[PDB]
Amino acid sequence: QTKEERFNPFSWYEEMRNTAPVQWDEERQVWDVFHYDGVKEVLEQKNIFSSDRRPPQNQRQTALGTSLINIDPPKHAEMRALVNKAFTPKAMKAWEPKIARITNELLQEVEHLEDIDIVEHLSYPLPVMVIADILGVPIEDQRQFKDWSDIIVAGPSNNERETLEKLQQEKMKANDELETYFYRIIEEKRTRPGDDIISVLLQAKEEGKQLTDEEIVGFSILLLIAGNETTTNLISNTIYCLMEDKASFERLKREKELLPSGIEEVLRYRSPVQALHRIVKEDVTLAGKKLKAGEHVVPWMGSAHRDAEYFEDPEVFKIDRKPNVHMAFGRGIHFCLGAPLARIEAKIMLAELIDRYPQMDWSPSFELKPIESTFVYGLKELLIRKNVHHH
């Protein structure tokens, strides 16, 4: 449809939530789940709704393919306990100054522009640079790291069938090069450990058990894929919400301590991840519908988040919303282990933007350019005028 309505899937969600919150789509071969309690049930009931998407033996065995997000317990629990040791508040204390520095570097790079793209200049590069730094990627390698990241999330330039195999081949090569890259870093950190996620993971032990090199490679790449574009879209979407609702913008500027809460409302209201994927392990009934083992389930957190039972005045952006029990980071055992990192990246960059440019507004040349996706909700660009030069 239009751009307006690529950035408004919520009307469709409301129709489906108020007619058949659990429904089979025969074309897509999935059960869509639209209502809060259904989405919550699907994500929490891991023994019924599987995350095991490990590729069969006759497909490529990437390290990513058996990484944390694609496995069920007991393996998932063992892996989770180990990688959790790298995402502590202790480690976060070391990450904040790095995030702040990178934020200041990015803002400085475009201080010469009155009109900037939030996406390209700020929210797109921040997560990439942060994750490279805290993983242990040395600064000299960081442009190659960024190029690999760009390829892994690129769209096709044209729809031609051959192009698609091209992009698919470039992504496979980026992944393979990233794997080779991280096996090397792991060797480096095995002899000269550092203050970085890879070093921490090399030393993590939980009941005698340790991560394999492969598992660390696959986790490192997973952090890229799971953490970059999502955090990007949280930051951009937050600016979009504030520019759309100037009263909230003004209020925020007077009550800095509201920013965390305002980000949580963005996580509810313009969720970077709209939906997830599960496979039914056993027959189950949900909203009176009979789901059969092996059938695919798509829970729509984006829709759960508009369910008035849990979010009064769901269509209203409330920077102080309470309660706000959203599932923007998932729910249950697969709950995003980067949620504190994403929250602080968004807080640090947004606070700096709001402090520096309290009069910012849409650029005159703003255009609504949504990411083309049903699972992902965000903007390809977001042109903002700082209003710190004259017109």
Ligand X SMILES: C[C@]12C[C@H](O)[C@H]3[C@@H](CCC4=CC(=O)CC[C@@]43C)[C@@H]1CC[C@@H]2C(=O)CO
Residue 138: how many other CB atoms lie within 10 Å: 13
Note whether 276 binds ligand X by CB under 6 A: yes
What residues have CB less than 8 Å from 113, skipping those under 6 apart?
121, 386
Note whether 68 binds ligand HEM by CB under 6 A: yes
- Applying CB under 6 A, among 171, 251, 253, 281 the residue interacting with ligand X is 171
Query: Which CB atom, from 266 or from 286, has the smaller least distance to ligand HEM?
Result: 266
| Contacted by 376, from ligand X, ligand HEM, none: CB < 5 to 8 Å by type | ligand X
Note whether 273 binds ligand HEM by CB under 6 A: yes
Q: Among residue numbers 203 through 262, which ones bind ligand HEM (CB under 6 A)?
A: 222-223, 226-227, 230-231, 234
- Applying CB under 6 A, among 69, 119, 174, 275 the residue interacting with ligand HEM is 69
Residue type at 349? M
Q: Supply the angle between the helices 213-244 and 161-191 in degrees, to the nearest 10.
A: 120
Residue pair 219/68 in contact by the 8 Å Cβ criterion:
yes
Contact region with ligand HEM (CB under 6 A), list: 163-171, 185-193, 203-211, 268-276: 268-276
Which two three-digit tokens encode residue 106? 């990015």
| Strands 49-50 and 278-280, sheet pairing | antiparallel
| Contacted by 136, from ligand X, ligand HEM, none: CB < 5 to 8 Å by type | none
Residue pair 43/330 in contact by the 8 Å Cβ criterion:
yes
- Applying CB under 6 A, among 102, 131, 242, 383 the residue interacting with ligand HEM is 131
The DSSP code for 64 is G
Distance of CA 14 to the CA centre of its chain: 23
| Contacted by 220, from ligand X, ligand HEM, none: CB < 5 to 8 Å by type | none
- Applying CB under 6 A, among 30, 118, 297, 336 the residue interacting with ligand HEM is 336
- Is residue 143 marked as binding? no
Contact region with ligand HEM (CB under 6 A), list: 108-116, 281-289, 336-344, 350-358: 336-344
C-alpha triplet 120, 124, 130: angle, nearest 5°: 135
C-alpha triplet 182, 184, 186: angle, nearest 5°: 70
- Is residue 6 marked as binding? no
**At 205, is the secondary structure helix, strand, or coil?**
coil
b/e per residue, 19-48, with b = 16+ CB within 10 A? eebbeeeeeeebbbbbbbebbbbbbbbbeb
- Is residue 343 marked as binding? no
- Applying CB under 6 A, among 342, 354, 382, 384 the residue interacting with ligand HEM is 342
Contact region with ligand HEM (CB under 6 A), list: 18-26, 57-65, 245-253, 324-332: 324-332
Residue pair 327/37 in contact by the 8 Å Cβ criterion:
no
| Contacted by 62, from ligand HEM, ligand X, none: CB < 5 to 8 Å by type | ligand X
- Applying CB under 6 A, among 22, 71, 126, 152 the residue interacting with ligand X is 152
Q: CA 80, 202, 214, 165 torsion: positive or negative?
A: positive
- Applying CB under 6 A, among 125, 218, 272, 302 the residue interacting with ligand HEM is 272
| Contacted by 30, from ligand X, ligand HEM, none: CB < 5 to 8 Å by type | ligand X
- Is residue 336 marked as binding? yes
Q: Report how far residue 29's alpha carbon sits from residue 292's, in angstroms, rounded to the nearest whole number.
A: 12
Q: Among residue numbers 35 through 64, which ones bind ligand X (CB under 6 A)?
A: 53, 55, 59-60, 62, 64
Q: Report how far residue 233's alpha carbon sits from residue 388's, in angstroms, rounded to the nearest whole number.
A: 25
- Is residue 35 marked as binding? no
Residue pair 263/343 in contact by the 8 Å Cβ criterion:
yes
Q: Report how far residue 71's alpha carbon sits from residue 339's, in angstroms, rounded to the nearest whole number.
A: 19
Note whether 230 binds ligand X by CB under 6 A: yes
Which two three-digit tokens encode residue 297? 């389930």
Q: Supply the angle between the helices 339-356 and 125-135 in degrees, to the nearest 10.
A: 130
Total residues in contact with ligand HEM, by rule CB under 6 A? 24
**At 101, is the secondary structure helix, strand, or coil?**
helix
Binding site for ligand HEM (CB under 6 A): 51, 68-69, 80, 131, 222-223, 226-227, 230-231, 234, 272-273, 276, 328-330, 334, 336-338, 341-342
Query: Which residues are documented as binding site?
Result: 76, 80, 278, 334, 336
Binding site for ligand X (CB under 6 A): 28-30, 53, 55, 59-60, 62, 64-65, 67, 69-70, 152-153, 171-172, 175, 222, 225-226, 229-230, 273, 276-277, 296, 373, 375-376
